């Protein structure tokens, strides 16, 4: 199939970019190497945040007609952030094509297209654990929690980051 090559050789051109550019606290790739179609990623929790010291795997499953569509990322860790499922789904409008479910004028450069990348997406996810957005409730009681009693947030986030530890 001449759609998955050219994914695969558009997935090296990601690889090459992150592996040459390497982002803060980031630190992802092909999980093993005889599939480069998933990947697995370390996310450390933003430096000056209730998230911090947290090390949060994640991981990112790329379709065969990348980079036409977006990739499907989603923490192996427990979490609690208004912009990730229960189940660990991350959902944030980079990896939303479109025609999908939420919207939001604003949110143009915020759907999926070909002009954007794993840097790019999880550059994104970090600056989302950082500063939060219930207008994205993947999560009712995060974002309930965190627009009204953020008090107990913190305290929760906190702990958070403790399992993320095996503490």
Same mark, same amino acid.
């Given at each position: 199939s001449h759609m998955a090559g050219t994914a695969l050789k558009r997935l090296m051109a990601e690889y090459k970019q992150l592996t040459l550019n390497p982002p803060e606290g980031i630190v992802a790739g092909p999980?093993? !190497?005889?599939?480069?179609?998933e990947w697995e990623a370390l996310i450390m929790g933003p !430096?000056?945040?209730?998230? !911090?010291?947290g090390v949060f795997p994640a991981i990112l499953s790329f379709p065969l007609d990348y980079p036409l569509s977006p990739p499907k990322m989603r923490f192996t860790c427990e979490m609690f952030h208004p912009?990730? @499922?229960?189940?660990?789904?991350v959902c944030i409008?980079?990896?939303? =094509?479109?025609?999908?479910?939420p919207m939001g @004028?604003?949110?143009? =450069?915020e759907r999926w297209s070909p002009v954007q990348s794993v840097e790019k997406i999880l550059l994104s996810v970090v600056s989302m654990l950082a500063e939060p957005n219930d !207008?994205?409730? =993947?999560n009712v009681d995060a974002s309930k929690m965190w627009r009204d009693d953020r008090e107990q947030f913190y305290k929760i986030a906190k702990q958070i980051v403790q399992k993320s530890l095996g503490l």
């Open positions: 999980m093993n !190497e005889e599939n480069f179609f !430096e000056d945040t209730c998230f !911090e010291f912009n990730i @499922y229960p189940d660990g789904r409008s980079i990896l939303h =094509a479109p025609g999908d479910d @004028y604003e949110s143009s =450069a !207008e994205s409730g =993947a």
